[PDB]
Design a protein around this motif. Structure first.
Motif, PDB file in Angstrom:
ATOM      1  N   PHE A  10      46.693  27.327   7.159  1.00  0.00           N
ATOM      2  CA  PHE A  10      47.857  26.998   7.967  1.00  0.00           C
ATOM      3  C   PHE A  10      48.848  28.146   7.969  1.00  0.00           C
ATOM      4  N   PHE A  11      48.958  28.839   6.845  1.00  0.00           N
ATOM      5  CA  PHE A  11      49.864  29.972   6.737  1.00  0.00           C
ATOM      6  C   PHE A  11      49.206  31.296   7.105  1.00  0.00           C
TER       7      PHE A  11
ATOM      8  N   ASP B 269      46.010  33.936  -2.181  1.00  0.00           N
ATOM      9  CA  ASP B 269      47.447  34.185  -2.138  1.00  0.00           C
ATOM     10  C   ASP B 269      48.272  33.102  -2.830  1.00  0.00           C
TER      11      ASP B 269
ATOM     12  N   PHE C  78      52.928  28.960  -2.870  1.00  0.00           N
ATOM     13  CA  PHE C  78      53.274  28.654  -1.482  1.00  0.00           C
ATOM     14  C   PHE C  78      53.483  27.155  -1.236  1.00  0.00           C
TER      15      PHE C  78
ATOM     16  N   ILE D  83      54.748  23.206  -0.919  1.00  0.00           N
ATOM     17  CA  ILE D  83      55.891  22.536  -0.314  1.00  0.00           C
ATOM     18  C   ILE D  83      56.741  21.912  -1.412  1.00  0.00           C
TER      19      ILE D  83
ATOM     20  N   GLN E   4      50.788  29.231  13.178  1.00  0.00           N
ATOM     21  CA  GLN E   4      50.684  29.618  11.770  1.00  0.00           C
ATOM     22  C   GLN E   4      51.982  29.292  11.042  1.00  0.00           C
ATOM     23  N   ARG E   5      52.399  28.038  11.165  1.00  0.00           N
ATOM     24  CA  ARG E   5      53.743  27.625  10.806  1.00  0.00           C
ATOM     25  C   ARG E   5      53.852  27.390   9.305  1.00  0.00           C
ATOM     26  N   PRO E   6      55.068  27.211   8.792  1.00  0.00           N
ATOM     27  CA  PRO E   6      55.228  26.823   7.390  1.00  0.00           C
ATOM     28  C   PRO E   6      55.026  25.325   7.221  1.00  0.00           C
ATOM     29  N   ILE E   7      54.965  24.908   5.961  1.00  0.00           N
ATOM     30  CA  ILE E   7      54.659  23.529   5.611  1.00  0.00           C
ATOM     31  C   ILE E   7      55.928  22.739   5.286  1.00  0.00           C
TER      32      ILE E   7
ATOM     33  N   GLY F 252      58.318  23.423   3.370  1.00  0.00           N
ATOM     34  CA  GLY F 252      58.852  23.696   2.049  1.00  0.00           C
ATOM     35  C   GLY F 252      58.491  25.079   1.555  1.00  0.00           C
ATOM     36  N   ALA F 253      58.273  26.013   2.487  1.00  0.00           N
ATOM     37  CA  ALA F 253      57.708  27.316   2.166  1.00  0.00           C
ATOM     38  C   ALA F 253      58.426  28.503   2.795  1.00  0.00           C
TER      39      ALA F 253
ATOM     40  N   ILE G  20      56.941  33.372   3.676  1.00  0.00           N
ATOM     41  CA  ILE G  20      55.520  33.055   3.577  1.00  0.00           C
ATOM     42  C   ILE G  20      54.685  34.189   4.158  1.00  0.00           C
TER      43      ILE G  20
ATOM     44  N   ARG H 222      54.948  37.314   1.898  1.00  0.00           N
ATOM     45  CA  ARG H 222      54.041  37.309   0.756  1.00  0.00           C
ATOM     46  C   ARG H 222      52.585  37.405   1.197  1.00  0.00           C
ATOM     47  N   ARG H 223      52.251  36.860   2.369  1.00  0.00           N
ATOM     48  CA  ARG H 223      50.915  37.067   2.919  1.00  0.00           C
ATOM     49  C   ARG H 223      50.655  38.547   3.171  1.00  0.00           C
TER      50      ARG H 223
END
Lengths: 171, 126
Positions: free
Chosen positions: A144-145, A151, A156, A158, B79-82, B84-85, B90, B93-94
């Motif tokens: 998703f990320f 990683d 990462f 929530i 490719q969104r955040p969840i 809480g990220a 995000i 760090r990727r």
RNA sequence: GAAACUGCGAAUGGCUCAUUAAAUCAGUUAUCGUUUAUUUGAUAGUUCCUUUACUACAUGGUAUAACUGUGGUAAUUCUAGA
RNA sequence: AUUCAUAAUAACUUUUCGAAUCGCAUGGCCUUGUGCUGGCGAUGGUUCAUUCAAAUUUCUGCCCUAUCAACUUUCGAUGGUAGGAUAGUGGCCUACCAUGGUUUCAACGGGUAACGGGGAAUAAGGGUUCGAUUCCGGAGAGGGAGCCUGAGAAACGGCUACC
RNA sequence: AAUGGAUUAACGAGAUUCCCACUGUCCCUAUCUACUAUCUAGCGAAACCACAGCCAAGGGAACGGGCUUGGCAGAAUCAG
RNA sequence: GUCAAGCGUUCAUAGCGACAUUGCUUUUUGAUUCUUCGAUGUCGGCUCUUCCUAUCAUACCGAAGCAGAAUUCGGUAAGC
RNA sequence: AUGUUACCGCAAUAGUAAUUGAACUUAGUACGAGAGGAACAGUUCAUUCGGAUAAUUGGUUUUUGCGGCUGUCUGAUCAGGCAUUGCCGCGAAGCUACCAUCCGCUGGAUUAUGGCUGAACGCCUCUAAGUCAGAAUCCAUGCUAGAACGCGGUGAUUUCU
RNA sequence: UGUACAACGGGGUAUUGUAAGCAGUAGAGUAGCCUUGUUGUUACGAUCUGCUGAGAUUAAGCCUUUGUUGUCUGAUUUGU
């Protein structure tokens, strides 16, 4: 009549109490999965296009897919199918439904939007409900990320903050 | 008003035009015409009768209804955040993921830690 | 830690004696003619299939429920829609 | 007592099983790596055996009736061959074939305020009668038929229909 | 009670009652066909005939085409 | 129809009305035998029209032992 | 036959038709001690009769229109004849059905009856003079025919005959 | 001698139910062929499928025609 319309990207939904009987005569004799014109039903919906998802007629009997008629029928339904939940394993059951053609018998028609027209809608497009949950699985989060194979989904993660009293925590 | 469909021919029955039949089992049939009615009383099969819509559609004649099922040539494009990220951090760090010397050094630290762990565990065992 | 997914069990118990006069049943044999969850005792070096890049094994993919909310019937352990 | 157990050749398989599960505890080697190894368990899992079962099955045995003596076989009745189905033998069912099979040693048919048995009352013995009824085996869920799920139901405090 | 009585299977273009079926017999009529009728060309009778041919009442041989009083009265004619 | 002893709880008449009596009709059945015996086709039903009213119903009304409902008597009325 | 012919009309006289019920409401009201139990107006429907019509449905079918079926003849096929309209199914058009549908008028004078004023009979009385309302009645409205000897209005009225 | 008429033709509307002809790696199958297939080929063989909601009929008391071809002065009588 009523149009329970939904915008699935925004996750939004609203009922619209429709009249203009001929601008719903357009909806008459229509199946599921078919897409007709927002402008044709309403200039307030000018430019938009929906998809007839389904609906409940009077006596609350829903529209079922694949049967190809407007009239009601008694089907010996089974699991893995709309319009019947089994209260036991193995239980098939005879229930009444309405079919996959649109007509005056309907009372609420459930629609989904596939394209957004020129104007904006009050309760669907101007708003957007968030994703109530985050992905609970490692690789689902990771893809998703778009991070890597390594990683650290663990960091990462929530974190959804809530306060019990004044003590607050992400649980 | 409404228009309906002959049981036999499958034809629009404008109001008044045609007959209706109600069998003892409460099945309500409609007939545009005495032709269809008489055949029904003869207990014929419209799928065998040639001029009928059922035969038409069973022999696949006038097939302009269906075309195909469409397919989209792309991805979901999120490719969104969840929630809480912090998607900005995000993706940051990727991107820090390549040049993995950070995680490699954390592994080296925990690695010498496992070294000293077996060492001190043997020491306590002695 | 409710609800819900899942797994079990719901085929036992309990009630009545309508049926049934070589039929059940009782004793007595067989399965060298068969199923058997469960328990209990033992039991899967051999799964890369142009088997060399065809493939992560410090490990892979998919919903979907519950829930959010739109809700529809006079009524149903009624149910759709997102 | 076997074409048994079991083993091997040759292939078949739309492909079966060969742990991506979980709780505790964290233990040891150093080639100082999140390297390598390690315990007590729960869950499930192919096969075999076991156990609780289940279904079929051998001999013997059932009340009154002849104002019921012939019964069965069209379209299964008796057998056999081949095949299908079954979890399995087998008319269980079909194709074909022989025409047989039971009977006064009471067949078959009718009736039963008949479910059967373990048992109860009653008596010197013999016996007669009762026994739905606390235990055992059967049958049923208002009558019938059907079927899904399941190891296991023809389930009924589960579904489908008709009455 | 062989001027035959009482039954009597079968048989009856015999008389009679009821039931099943069936039906235009009927509710309630409609429609169609050929031959007619119809018109034409041609042929061409008969029965019957006091005279003839409009009603009412009257009286009258007591139920008139005629008489009486009234009503009315308009060539010639076709199909029925 | 007249009259009214009586019935009607009491009261002859709301309604009935014995004994007596005056009339009408010709839908009965007699009586008669005028016409008809050199023939008036002879019961009923079916069909179909028309007429009378001594009105069963319907329209409007009056009276009652008519509270209402229901009923009875009576009038114009034979339109239907 | 009216001078001819054509058109538009009048309207004498005759005929005549519309009928009855139910339901809801009024109202469980009035009335009735209670028991029970109305009515006028209004609305929707029906019965009987009538006059039309054939969109729909049904019937009918020599459309001998389409298809099929039997027997037989045409060498076979194709296509057809005969079968007292061969038989069956469909079948338009036309006809037709309370087996279908549509429509079926309102004003006056009157009876019976109840009454107004009102004398005779100095009161009183619906009556005697006068007078009001009043019925499925009567007559008109309306509808049907139009006097073939009832009528009117209008148009054109023959030539080298 | 014309927004004239008529007979044909066309179009539409309706009725019926998918024409003959051809083809088929369709076809119960039975016989014969051989290079014995793998559609083997050949003779026969109801019926099926495609061309085919095709074909046929369609005012005779259906509608409509920018079409075609034709027709359009014979008799008699009538006067205020």
């Amino acid at each position: 009549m009523k149009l329970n319309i939904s915008y699935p990207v925004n996750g939004s939904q609203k009922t619209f109490e429709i009249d203009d009987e001929h601008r719903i005569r357009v909806f008459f004799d229509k199946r599921i999965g078919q897409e007709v014109d927002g402008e044709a039903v309403g200039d307030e919906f000018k430019g938009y296009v929906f998809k007839i998802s389904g609906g409940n007629d009077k006596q609350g009997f829903p529209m079922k897919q694949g049967v190809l008629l407007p009239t009601r029928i008694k089907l010996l339904l089974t699991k893995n199918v709309s319009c019947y939940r089994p209260r036991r394993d193995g239980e098939r059951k005879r229930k009444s439904v309405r079919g996959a053609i649109v007509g005056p018998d309907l009372a609420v028609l459930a629609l989904v939007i596939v394209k957004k027209g020129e104007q904006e809608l009050e309760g669907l497009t101007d708003t957007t409900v968030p994703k109530r949950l985050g992905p609970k699985r490692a690789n689902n989060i990771r893809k998703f990320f778009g991070l890597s194979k390594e990683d650290d989904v663990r960091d990462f993660v929530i974190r959804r903050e809530v306060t019990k009293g004044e003590k607050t925590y992400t649980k | 008003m409404k228009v309906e469909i002959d049981s036999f021919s499958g034809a629009k029955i404008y109001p008044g035009r045609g007959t209706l039949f109600v069998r003892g089992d409460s099945k309500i049939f409609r007939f545009q015409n005495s032709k269809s009615a008489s055949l029904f009383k003869q207990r014929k099969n419209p799928r065998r009768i040639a001029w009928t819509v059922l035969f038409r559609k069973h022999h696949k004649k006038g097939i302009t209804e269906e075309v195909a099922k469409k397919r989209s040539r792309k991805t979901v494009k999120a490719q969104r955040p969840i929630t809480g990220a912090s998607l900005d951090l995000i993706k940051e760090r990727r991107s820090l993921k390549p040049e993995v010397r950070k995680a490699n050094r954390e592994e080296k630290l925990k690695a010498n830690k496992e070294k000293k762990k077996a060492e001190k565990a043997a020491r306590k065992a002695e």
